[PDB]
Design a protein around this nucleic acid. Structure first.
Lengths: 54, 213
RNA sequence: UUGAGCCUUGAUGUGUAGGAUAGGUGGGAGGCUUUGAAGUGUGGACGCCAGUCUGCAUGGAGCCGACCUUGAAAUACCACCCUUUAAUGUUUGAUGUUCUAACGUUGACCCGUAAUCCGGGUUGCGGACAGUGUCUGGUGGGUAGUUUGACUGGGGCGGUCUCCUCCUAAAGAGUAACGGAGGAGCACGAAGGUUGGCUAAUCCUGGUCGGACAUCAGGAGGUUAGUGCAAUGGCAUAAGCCAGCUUGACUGCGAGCGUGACGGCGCGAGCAGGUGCGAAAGCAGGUCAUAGUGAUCCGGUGGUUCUGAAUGGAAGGGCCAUC
RNA sequence: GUUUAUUAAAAACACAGCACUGUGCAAACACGAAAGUGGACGUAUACGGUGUGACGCCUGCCCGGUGCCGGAAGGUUAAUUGAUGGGGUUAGCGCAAGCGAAGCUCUUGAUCGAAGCCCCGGUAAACGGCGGCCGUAACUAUAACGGUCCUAAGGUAGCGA
RNA sequence: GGUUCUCCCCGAAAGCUAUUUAGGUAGCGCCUCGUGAAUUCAUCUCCGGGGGUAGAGCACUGUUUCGGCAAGGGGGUCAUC
RNA sequence: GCCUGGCGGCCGUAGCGCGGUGGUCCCACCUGACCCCAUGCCGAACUCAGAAGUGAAACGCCGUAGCGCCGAUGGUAGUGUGGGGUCUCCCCAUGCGAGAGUAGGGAACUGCCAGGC
RNA sequence: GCGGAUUUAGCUCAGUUGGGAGAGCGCCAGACUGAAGAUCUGGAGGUCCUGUGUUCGAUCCACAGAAUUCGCACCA
RNA sequence: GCGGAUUUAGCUCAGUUGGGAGAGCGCCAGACUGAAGAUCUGGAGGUCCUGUGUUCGAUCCACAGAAUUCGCACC
């Protein structure tokens, strides 16, 4: 965002409803380590690849 | 993507002319050709994709069949390109000429599971050129599954640089593009590698076309 | 001489087996057949031997091929694909190499002319050079400019508005000093949750692999405990803890109001849906919190049912992501 | 000497030689918008840089840094010049969704590419420059003799306020 | 920098927040002049308890010292410090 | 009046010691148990069963001045509300009282509902 | 991170027929020396940068990744 | 006062992830020299300031103290 060891934004589209978000993860530690079940259409918690695909 | 349907329709309109469809004697065929670039042995880019055409043409696909007695009188009405009984495979042991023949001048080989001889004898002369059988259902009401394989093509590359199959006949290029794009959806779903294309053509009884993409 | 396209002309291949000189990549099962159109038999002559030339057979005999045999891999018949590169044609750029009616004549001869300006030609000279118009470059204090906070037991240094705590300083609230102690320029692949579970030691005594020590069974039963950087304070129905099951930190509004000055920053009756959390009673906006940015103006960017000086599309605007 | 009349009255320094430097020459300078008038009625021993500090000797010495510039063996990466890839505007092809060819173009940092300078090299008038702690002379302690430290480096070509 | 004739009652102008602040600035008044209004607002009598200005202790940590010994630690001496 | 069980009013007279008695009632131990539940090891800790046995305890009281703790009447800090004084803010004319100190104080109190002499 | 390149011994680096994986400088050691340097010659020498997939057999062919690296993007 | 450096082998000071304590050099042996040094291979040489903490492990950092030392605060 300006530096290197810094807290960075990863662009986060949903699994079903298109809608995208962002905030905070980190290049300090290993990166292969998340996905999630939440829903920005709120209708059914099912699938979310995150910004990341695990 | 590979291509889309207007791209193919617009090229089929030309492949079916007197310049490109250089006629011998009868109503001939049209073909889809697709050639790749980085293709090696790894696995990611191998196919088989048995694609039963959306709009079947003037000339149907050459299906052999092998039934059992109860469903056999249905299948007898159902226009198989040839028949041999689940029984009479016993009699075909060591008949090299027929074996090589059938592998030469049919294209599909649908068998009731009781036919377990057909697995053994026929391989050796079918496999190096690459066409195939499948386990037929056991039922009487069987026509539309014969018609299935009497309309279908295979996306053959297990290790070679290019894939090319019959797709229509001389009469109508528009319904025939809708045949070609169904082949292309089945490919892009299997080998997710897209820019490894070299070229995409269509072709006849002989001369090929340099499709607009 | 050297660069870009382009086949008009060429050409970089011998091993067994297959009566036989096998680039790969594909289709299927046939292909040629008018006698002056095809092979097929057999001679003869050139030689960088891997080319071919030139004589004569015969020719609706059936011959090349899945069809019978061989192999590391088929062959008859149409498709497919031209390049690493040469000779030339046909398309064409550049640098050297120079000649030279540009040009300049601030060089002569001739010449209007008892002529310093000055007109013009034979000639002589160098030579596309000159001329400057901006673009890239530092090079110097060779115009002009400014004196850019404040804190001053008057100045130069050493300190702070920052946004923070304790001291100091007169309790609502505050009021420094080149004054006392010390300071955010950050923080989760979890320091993540809602049910559940409680009890940690020193030192005394024991016992495979010691020689202070690390799970223990016991003391006495002390409420003599631990705080992964900085610090104050939490406080034990533990948050430290830590194993199972797994990451809700709902979309939207809010009676009530705390109130303040345009930003704002706080939380909630109750109502919608359904949204997940548990049997149930029922419970709730996630790292212990404190330290963590934009007056805001110009920017940019990405999706639209919000629009756009007669329209239609559409600049540029509106909604808000995204900074 | 009379030269800064205006603090000093020179206790200022204007000499003048020269290695080097700018011109093989429509020369260096351009003041005036068009001058070619200083230099020229003239050549690099004419005129100008920056100085010089009588005369005469003497300029030892030493290239780290930093200048003066010159160059090309070679990289940093440009006006110059445009591999390509993604777009726009759009024929053809689509009952629709929408694909999509020239041409015209947008937008590439394709690729060459040194002004600086890494560097390569010459500079003694360019910019300044002489390190310390550990041990010492038939006495003081002179401070000649000494090991080293990646320090760029210890008072020197003199005469002693 | 200066109020160019009179008169009369409300009326400290002169500050809490700061300010790339320097007798310079954004709103402000404890202000009047005109609207709107309630037991509005304040000292007392009281109701109810957090403050911690005082003040007082040795409880805690921090400790005076005199007594008495708390395997603490010294002196003297045998000895191999 | 005396004894128990459950639940409150109770923020410390609402804290320990030494003992000495108590019950097949109350608890509970204790001794079984794949379980429900699973000790990320053990029923030790909740539990499920309740046989068999006594109070080791758990849990309660009765005696109790060892150790916390209680405390009058009065005197006093020091000071609003004042008048006068006056080396380091006193002394009166009043609002009233923590502590020093002495008489002197001890193991609290109270209720709701069921069941037992 | 856009695309090429590389990583093989300590360091520079061969590795292109996919079949033995190694040379150079240096290190060790012997010979030699009067003792070193030298010269000669033996010996030593590995995360084949990662891990798979494909192959009878993988440094090798392919894919994804990290680092070293070259040029490179840029008006949130 | 604050903030830095430093107390690491005879000499000169390098070094620290925070787990080993270094070499230019001086000594010692080894032999070549009667010997010694050069040069040589082997081997060695330590208050890593003290205290407390963080930590697996503190020579190192953080913190309290001690001490040498420097720039500035003074006018």
């Amino acid at each position: 965002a300006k530096g290197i060891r810094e807290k960075i934004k990863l662009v986060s589209s949903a699994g079903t409803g298109h809608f995208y978000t962002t905030t905070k993860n980190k290049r300090t530690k290993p990166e292969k380590l998340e996905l999630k079940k939440f829903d920005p259409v709120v209708r059914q918690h099912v699938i979310y690849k995150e910004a990341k695909i695990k | 993507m590979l291509a889309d349907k207007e791209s193919l329709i617009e090229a089929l309109k030309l492949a079916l002319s007197t310049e490109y469809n250089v006629k011998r004697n009868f109503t001939q065929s049209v073909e889809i050709i697709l050639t790749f670039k980085g293709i090696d042995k790894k696995g990611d880019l191998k196919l088989r994709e048995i694609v039963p055409l959306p709009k079947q043409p003037s000339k149907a696909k050459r299906v052999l069949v092998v039934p059992s007695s109860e469903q056999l009188e249905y299948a007898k009405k159902a226009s198989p390109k040839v028949v041999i009984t689940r029984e009479e495979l016993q009699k075909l042991q060591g008949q090299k000429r027929p074996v090589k023949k059938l592998a030469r001048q049919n294209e599909w080989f649908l068998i009731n599971q009781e036919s377990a001889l057909a697995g053994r004898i026929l391989g050796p002369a079918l496999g190096p050129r690459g066409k195939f059988p499948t386990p037929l259902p056991n039922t009487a009401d069987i026509s539309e599954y014969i018609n299935r394989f009497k309309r279908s093509v295979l996306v053959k590359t297990k290790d070679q640089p290019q894939v090319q199959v019959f797709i229509g006949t001389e009469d109508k290029p528009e319904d025939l593009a809708e045949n070609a794009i169904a082949v292309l959806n089945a490919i892009e779903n299997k080998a997710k590698v897209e820019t490894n294309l070299r070229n995409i053509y269509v072709k006849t009884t002989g001369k090929a076309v340099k499709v607009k993409r």
